[PDB]
Amino acid sequence: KVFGRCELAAAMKRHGLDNYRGYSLGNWVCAAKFESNFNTQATNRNTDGSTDYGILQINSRWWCNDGRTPGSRNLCNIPCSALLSSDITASVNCAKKIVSDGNGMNAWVAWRNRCKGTDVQAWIRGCRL
């Protein structure tokens, strides 16, 4: 599924993410836009054999198992594939873990380079929230 700006905002909110670990809702819509273009079915292979999955592009070397990344720790205890479903519950649930470990949303290349320190509230401008 390919989410709408607004619709994802609303949903991430419903799912406990507005200000989770101190990151505005916008910080999250932003990261997801530039990470997957609101497309939950997105995947991307990195050079190290790992692959990135879903709306929030969670990695398989640590968070989820996709049965073809060796180093692999499945800290989220979910099959990677789960993260691609039209319900974002699994992805949020797992994203909560990632963001709490230690580096905040720095764990997400794209948030850091394209989201961090910009007026992220602009991503939920217009929304019934």
Read off the DSSP letter of residue 75.
T
**In the block, residue with structure tokens 């989770």:** 20
**CB < 8 Å & 24+ apart, contacts of 43-49:** 43/84
Residue 124 in tokens: 């939920």
Any idea what the Cα angle at residue 87 is, between residues 84 and 90, rounded to 5°? 70
Buried b (16+ CB within 10 A) or exposed e, 70-80: eebebebebbb
Rounded CA gap, 98 and 17, in Å? Answer: 13
| Feature table: binding site for substrate | 101
Token pair 């599924």 is found at 1
Measured CA to CA, the distance from residue 120 to residue 12 in angstroms comes to 15
Q: Give yes or no for a contact between 18 and 24, defined as CB atoms under 8 angstroms apart.
A: yes
Cα torsion for 109, 19, 42, 119, to the nearest 10°?
Answer: -60
Q: How far apart are CA 101 and CA 105, in angstroms?
A: 10
DSSP state of 19: T
**Residue of 35, 48, 66, 119 marked catalytic:** 35
Residue 111 main-chain phi, psi, to 5 deg? -70, -50
Q: What's the CA gap between 92 and 56, in Å, rounded? A: 8
The residue from 48, 52, 66, 119 that is catalytic is 52
Q: Which tokens go with 127?
A: 């929304």
Residue 48 catalytic?
no
Question: What CATH number is associated with residue 50?
Answer: 1.10.530.10
Range of 99's domain? 1-129
Domain count, the chain: 1
87 assigned to active site = no
The number of helices, as runs of H, and strands, as runs of E, in the chain is 4, 3
Q: Which residues are annotated as a binding site?
A: 101
